[PDB]
Enzyme design. Structure first.
Site, PDB file in Angstrom:
ATOM      1  N   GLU C 413     -20.552 106.418  33.062  1.00 19.17           N
ATOM      2  CA  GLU C 413     -21.095 105.387  32.654  1.00 19.17           C
ATOM      3  C   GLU C 413     -22.138 104.997  33.806  1.00 19.17           C
ATOM      4  O   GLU C 413     -23.065 104.546  33.377  1.00 19.17           O
ATOM      5  CB  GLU C 413     -20.017 104.093  32.592  1.00 19.17           C
ATOM      6  CG  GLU C 413     -19.235 104.237  31.264  1.00 19.17           C
ATOM      7  CD  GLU C 413     -19.840 104.812  30.103  1.00 19.17           C
ATOM      8  OE1 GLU C 413     -20.821 104.179  29.536  1.00 19.17           O
ATOM      9  OE2 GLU C 413     -19.598 105.914  29.754  1.00 19.17           O
ATOM     10  N   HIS C 543     -19.379 109.004  12.488  1.00 21.40           N
ATOM     11  CA  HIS C 543     -21.130 109.017  12.560  1.00 21.40           C
ATOM     12  C   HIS C 543     -21.390 109.000  11.237  1.00 21.40           C
ATOM     13  O   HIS C 543     -22.609 108.382  11.110  1.00 21.40           O
ATOM     14  CB  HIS C 543     -21.598 110.287  13.375  1.00 21.40           C
ATOM     15  CG  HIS C 543     -20.891 110.119  14.892  1.00 21.40           C
ATOM     16  ND1 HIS C 543     -19.694 110.618  14.976  1.00 21.40           N
ATOM     17  CD2 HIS C 543     -21.443 109.782  15.795  1.00 21.40           C
ATOM     18  CE1 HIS C 543     -19.447 110.504  16.469  1.00 21.40           C
ATOM     19  NE2 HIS C 543     -20.495 109.843  17.037  1.00 21.40           N
TER      20      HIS C 543
END
Lengths: 652, 652, 652
Positions: C413, C543
């Site tokens: 991150e 997705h």
């Protein structure tokens, strides 16, 4: 930033030195004749067209150099011819005659050499309007386009017609030995004497001994001019003369030779109601004098129009005066009372020209030109002529007296001179009027302005106690109509007749059958006695028999009316157009000089547009000038028949 | 009206400031790589081509450093090789022979390595003409463009016929143990002995012996010469030779391979009238010598031309002298009476060069060269050769004896050496003439000036009372024509014959038929015995067997005549061209040295244009040189047939 | 050499004064607006394009002003939008829900208006690549290029599948009310329980309730996705997604959408031998676990891979461990031994990120971001996301615990945000990754380096006495292959499947069957239960239903492998690639920052070339990373047949 253009010898040097060349610096290669622009990390070749060799003088420039050299030589040669012309006209001697032969031959030979030297210069590739106009005005071969024999024959015939007209002599049947010429014999007799038989005989006798003699000469003159026009790419000789008014190369101002004809036709139609009433009144007054010789329904005799051809009806004013007891506008008492002289008349004209804003006049005119009669030991021409000798020389040759007429002619000659001084700045080829109706119009409007009662009152010619009544104004309007409006149909019909006779539209065995019938219909002029085809009546006039285009009179009158109205508009005058005066009006002089300086450098359309406001030749000033006359003419012809009968003839 | 070129980073500030940009100011934009011209109320984009990359650390600099390194190592290596060659020429020993083997192998291996290392250096991105020409010379791979076996067999064949030519021996049929070599037996037999039988037998036997063993070898050599010429992008081996004369990339001086062919043909065609008259007179003299062996219309015998292959007609000058009663010009008897040696030959010759303006020549040559035969201790070759060893070393090998002829040969050799040091500033590759006809022409032009009686009179070689009448001028001109002009048709046809033999248009079964057809029609000489394709007569010459170009001699003659005429024009000489001398004319030497220093860097056409003024080939000085001879030949050929006939032969 | 530019009012003056113009001086005339360059003996006209009417306001200036104005305001609107989303993501509340509803509405309406404004700014006349690229992103209408109804129904269908996927629940037949969602009810049971029956039922039930329902929706979604793709100039919606990777107008780095397909196929083909070895060994371990459910030659079951889509084999790592007795590498227990928390994890991450030479980042993120779940008063999302809030505000959403998995994701991150602020100099539009496979690659490469045992020992995570044998290396390599290499065939094929689904090459009645055919031949995985085309198993992906391109993962894997290899090459790593660590290597961080600062302004192909050295992607790092594992798999494939079999099925 800013950068220059680099140039080295060899491309190897360019590569070795392009490293330090900053961007934006142009690189030109003399060896390779290439151009490069320094771009980021390289140089981009600039595309270049085909090699253009250095012209020492372009074909346009070669014409420019030739024209300048010709004009420089022309100024001296023309001045020598002009001064020799002045000497001959001041005194007529054998030595004076022979130097006309030398000057004329020298000027003609020089003109022919330059015209031939100019004919190879093409007018298509020259975009300079002044240069193109100079070349076409210099390349006019004229009679030389034909063979030597044809050109010589045409010139000999032209001289023959001029000689026959000048030496035309008529002998009375009572005394065959007693004979008289047209001028001043026939002209004065048919202008003053009121005998119908005497005027009829002189009209018939002259047109017989001239018409019969000139008929084969004029016919051969017409065909030779027509074939010369064909060799000059002209449809007829009338088209050749209309080429002066022809304008090409200027956008928004081009004028064709056919446009002149249609404008003349349109203007004549506009003047037709005014001329018809004028002709009807003149016709009516002739019954008041000769009730048993003419009929009001029919036309008017040609010999009874105050002359032979009906050119001027001024001679009929005594026969057509509305109120004979009313004195005419004449200030001759002021001349004798104050001892006025011709030199004083010109001085007042110059002072008036100064008043209207135009500058002074050269003193060389006063020290080189005569005004009064130059004694009697020498012979001098008394005809009103204004001289533009070139290179700053301006003169006037006439036996000027102290008459209102002479005061107008002096103004007329000044008006000619003012034009001569004005286009003087233009080159020798362009140092002239745009057409043949401009220089005369300036003199005419100057004479018209000088004849106004207000101008006479301002300078003291007219008494302050003089009153302006309706009868005097009406008589003046009638007098102007007879002199100017009266000759408009004469110029209209004669130039028209010459146009289609040159065009070949008139068969030979019907020539007089057309002219004398057309004269009765369009204009209402009738021959007192019938004339067959052996007569050559239309060619009996001076201009037609001397190779002169007669359209100048109609164009100059149309221009002179437009100029007078435009000057009046610029002079903020209040009152009738006939009483309008341009005295003490700087606007009128400045506006007039605006086109005067142009001359023929600019097209005549531009010169006309400069003052009146349009390139057209409308006769609105003519109608406005004679509107009180037209209303009075309609009043006089409210009961009298208006028009003319084609059928009626004095011999029928 | 003055401006410049502006630039800006992007179009944002460009169009925010284009209003402030004055008209006519060019603008360059770096971001868009565009060019604009500021016109009245607008800007027009200037068309730009593809961007040319700037010079950088590319092949350009890498090759230039490689060229400098090659020149430095070649200077020493060639100096060592030339040193060994001179030492071997001075002393012929077994140690000298081994030196040639070592020096030759190293020089060839070094040259081929430089050629290989320059092969991958293309000239497309190189713009330096000097570098482009130098790298092209480096990239002259030669026979290595083919396979190695093809090159090896071609060299083996070339050595075979060259050795056979050297050892070519013919034996008398009655005496087999006694045989006569070509050098100098057969040459002397046809140069001194006038017997038809002996000359014909030697001529026939040699060509049969040479042809029957070299015809297959010459065919394979020609085929191989065609093979690697096609691999070298040439239509034949002739174009391979013509590549040296070919010029590309130079504006106004580019030359094509076919251009020299057409120029040589055109020059010969206009030479033909003079050659036919000369052939007519030589034929006329042949009738005087042998009436029954030459036809009035037939061509000359091949063996009766004074030499072996009919090249030089100098030996015929005794039999073709215009007036044998006139003694020839020769100062040898005076020179030996003055006690002058070969040292005095070069000393007076050096006086001549310093007389013509050329500066002093280095004393290193004097201490490094011989002018006499070095006795018998060390064998020395007497062949005329001028040596440019390098590093300022210059030598000339010749057994210069005290004779008039050796004086000319000594004149020619130092003419070679003066051309050698003329362009010493040029690099190793450029250290050469532009072609093979320049150095010999330079050694010929001043040799003719030295042979002139004026030079002999100036240096005291000739008596001041020497008489120079037309008879001795004609005799000298005819001798020059036989020695120089006479061989011009032979040089043209043999080179043309070898050109088409490489092209292959003439089939291998017609080589001899075409050769004799050219001999009869062009040379005007017919063989005494017919030859079939077994005979290989053209290869019997040294040049053809040893792969030597033959167009160099004809071009040199044209070069030397043009060079001499320009020198005479520069020296302001008046009189016949053959009597022209360049002594005491410093302008001629300086002007000549202007292109002598240039070397082979510039195109040979530029050099020819600089000398005289004619960029292309010309034979104009030939007419000026031999004008009295041409008139004499025409006068003397009025009673004899002019030209030749191919039909007649000595055998038929 | 220098020169300039000269001007003339008229060309007549130019012609007269062209003689005085030196070479290199440009001649300009305003009358004709023509430019000339002074050349040798003449002037060459410069070619000029059409004259522009001084467009001082180009579209480039207006676009640049519009872009700057847009970027300034777009920054604020996106900033406050990101704050509201972060507030909701840290505290889920009803007032928060409406916050993005208003923020998203304003942002969407603002984006469409700026896109509408950019529509009248065509890119043809724009030369700035940055301006052109930014406006191209602005002019991306997307769903609004079609009509409003098509966009509205496409959004409604998109919302329907997204809701259906989110609420996708399956209930056990025995317990109707007992139902489990896909996340985490379904995923937990299949990843933990190895039972064949339970996994098969969950796999079958999930694809029956979701595949059947979404089949008409997906087909309608695909049809509409093809509708605006061609309206956006793309042959299919797959090409629309591939347009991001397309590079146009960049010479030497241009990339096409078709090139991506070819390179991706080429990379997969060469990867295939490594995948086949891994699939063979994973199959070999599967018969070890379940011998009666998997064939030694047949493909793997769909539900027996740890992922119901067959994405990751990480759950099979325990079942397919090379050596189950060797303990795995993990230092989580050492973190709690040293009393570490999420704050220490991020603090050590920054210390690692500054040990690689990159500068420390500000304190705002630390106080504005949470690293642990904020208790239970406020609900927060723990999904790994990076907050590019703009205005120098950056945040990370993660409920990081004291674990190695959270340690690596925390590294992932911060690497995301470290990529985000690296290109902060880019404008708002260009403040993004070059492609969708770059932001994840940046966080992956250094997180793996942090996970390397050398990094753990350096900062004390792992004891220095830990032994690094091949057994642990092989176990680590296999886990990397299962997680990273294992998902490559699934990622490549599914994107390949969806591409031709948009293209329509494979018909609708074959899509899923072609998918399963591709699952067998390409992926090597076979479904356990046969179905019909009502099943829409590929659409069961998150997705596919949420409109996310799946090529991002396969590209990111090869991108991160290339990045890691370049990092090791820059760090000069020696030994196995999987043990390569970038810690304490300032140069490696500098090289990474060379493209981190670059952002998306430059083409991603250029960025890839800058990192490694190859413009195109390559699989070379894969071989170096997994070479010990590739040899181990080859050695252990004595019973593992390389490849798979399409014929075998769990049901057949």
């Amino acid at each position: 930033g800013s950068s220059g253009v680099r140039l080295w010898a060899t491309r190897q040097a360019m590569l070795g030195q392009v490293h330090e060349v900053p961007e934006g610096w142009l690189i030109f290669v003399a060896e390779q004749e290439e151009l490069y622009v320094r771009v980021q990390n390289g140089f981009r070749k600039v595309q270049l067209e085909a090699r253009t060799p250095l012209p020492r003088s372009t074909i346009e420039e070669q014409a420019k150099t030739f024209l300048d050299k010709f004009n420089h030589e022309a100024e001296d040669l023309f001045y020598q011819s002009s001064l020799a012309s002045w000497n001959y006209n001041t005194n007529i001697t054998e030595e004076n005659v022979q130097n006309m032969n030398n000057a004329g031959d020298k000027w003609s030979a020089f003109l022919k050499e330059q015209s031939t030297l100019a004919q190879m210069y093409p007018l298509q590739e020259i975009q300079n309007l002044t240069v193109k106009l100079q070349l076409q005005a210099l390349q006019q071969n004229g009679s030389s386009v034909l063979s030597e024999d044809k050109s010589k024959r045409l010139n000999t015939i032209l001289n023959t017609m001029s000689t026959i007209y000048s030496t035309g002599k008529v002998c009375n049947p009572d005394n065959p030995q007693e004979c008289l010429l047209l001028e001043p014999g026939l002209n004065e007799i048919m202008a003053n004497s009121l005998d119908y038989n005497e005027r009829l005989w002189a009209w018939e006798s002259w047109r017989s001994e001239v018409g019969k003699q000139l008929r084969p000469l004029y016919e051969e003159y017409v065909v030779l001019k027509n074939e010369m026009a064909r060799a000059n790419h002209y449809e007829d000789y009338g088209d050749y003369w209309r080429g002066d008014y022809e304008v090409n190369g200027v956008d928004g101002y081009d004028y064709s030779r056919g446009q002149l004809i249609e404008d003349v036709e349109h203007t004549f139609e506009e003047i037709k109601p005014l001329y018809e009433h004028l002709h009807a009144y003149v016709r009516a007054k002739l019954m008041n004098a000769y009730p048993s010789y003419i009929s009001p329904i029919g036309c008017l005799p040609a010999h009874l129009l105050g002359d032979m051809w009906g050119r001027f009806w001024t001679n009929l004013y005594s026969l057509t005066v509305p109120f004979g007891q009313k004195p005419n506008i004449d200030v001759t008492d002021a001349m004798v009372d104050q001892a006025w002289d011709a030199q004083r008349i010109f001085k007042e004209a110059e002072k008036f020209f100064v008043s209207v804003g135009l500058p002074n006049m050269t003193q060389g005119f006063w020290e080189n030109s005569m005004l009064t009669d130059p004694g009697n030991v020498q012979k001098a021409v008394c005809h009103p002529t204004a001289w533009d000798l070139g290179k700053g020389d301006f003169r006037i040759l006439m036996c000027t007296k102290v008459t209102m007429d002479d005061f107008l002619t002096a103004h007329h000659e000044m008006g000619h001179i003012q034009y001569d001084m004005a286009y003087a700045a233009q080159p020798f080829l362009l140092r002239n009027g745009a057409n043949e109706g401009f220089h005369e119009a300036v003199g005419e409007i100057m004479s018209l302005s000088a004849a106004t009662p207000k101008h006479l009152k301002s300078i003291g010619l007219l008494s302050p106690d003089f009153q302006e009544d309706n009868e005097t104004e009406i008589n003046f309007l009638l007098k102007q109509a007879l002199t100017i409006v009266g000759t408009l149909p004469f110029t209209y019909m004669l130039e028209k007749w010459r146009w289609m006779v040159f065009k070949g539209e008139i068969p030979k065995d019907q020539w007089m059958k057309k002219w004398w019938e057309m004269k009765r219909e369009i204009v209402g002029v009738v021959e007192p006695v019938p004339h067959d085809e052996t007569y050559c009546d239309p060619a009996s006039l001076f201009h037609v028999s001397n190779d002169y285009s007669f359209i100048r009179y109609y164009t100059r009158t149309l221009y002179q009316f437009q100029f007078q109205e435009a000057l009046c508009q610029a002079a903020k005058h209040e009152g009738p157009l006939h009483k309008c005066d341009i005295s003490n009006s700087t606007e009128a002089g400045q506006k007039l000089f605006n086109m005067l300086r142009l001359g023929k450098s600019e097209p005549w359309t531009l010169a006309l547009e400069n003052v009146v406001g349009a390139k057209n030749m409308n006769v609105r000033p003519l109608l406005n000038y004679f509107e009180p006359l037209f209303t009075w003419l309609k009043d006089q012809n409210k009961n009298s028949f208006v028009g003319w009968s084609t059928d009626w003839s004095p011999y029928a």
